[PDB]
Ligand binder design. Structure first.
Ligand SMILES: O=C(O)CCn1cnc2ccccc21
Length: 167
């Protein structure tokens, strides 16, 4: 049993809810929250900007030190950093950004990072400001992630479309 409440069950391991991931993290304090990161860990907008704002910019300060030491992530890659006030850990995962021309086949590689963690609170990778087809992103999640993932969909309208269209 875990603390996640109000989710619709899509599969054995994937759950979904219309929720603000920031407000969900603050309530649950999950072991792992996933950030929709870029390779520079520049948390300007979208999910990343919202998570970072909720940490009072401490996520960005920590991230800048990580990049200064290690250099940029790979598209499809990840790193584990603090979850600050939101979670124990933040898994920063880089999905491909269609608005930068990145290979959508890298979305599966991105979701494979989730398999290193038994339970996660996450957004749909590569959706919204990154531009990828959201139904395709949920499909890749279901067909890639084997650990238990609780998806926070920000767009209510989108939430209802993801559920209604789910195969
Ligand atoms: O709803 C999500 O969580 C996914 C990212 N996203 C946010 N607003 C959106 C509006 C349209 C499509 C995706 C959108």
């Amino acid at each position: 049993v875990n603390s996640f409440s109000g989710y619709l069950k899509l599969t054995d391991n994937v759950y979904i809810k219309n929720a603000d991931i920031v407000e969900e993290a603050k309530k649950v304090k999950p072991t792992v929250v996933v950030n929709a990161a870029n390779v520079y860990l520049k948390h300007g907008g979208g999910v990343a900007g919202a998570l970072n704002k909720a940490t009072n910019n401490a996520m960005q300060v920590e991230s800048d030190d990580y990049i200064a030491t290690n250099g940029p992530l790979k598209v499809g890659g990840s790193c584990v950093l603090s979850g600050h006030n939101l979670a124990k850990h933040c898994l920063h995962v880089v999905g491909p950004n269609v608005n930068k021309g990145e290979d959508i086949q890298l979305l599966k590689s991105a979701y494979e990072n989730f398999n290193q963690h038994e339970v996660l609170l996450a957004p749909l990778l590569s959706a919204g400001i990154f531009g990828a087809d959201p139904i395709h992103s949920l499909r890749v999640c279901v067909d890639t992630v084997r650990t238990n993932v609780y998806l926070a969909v920000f767009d209510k309208n989108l939430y209802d479309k993801l559920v209604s269209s789910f195969l």
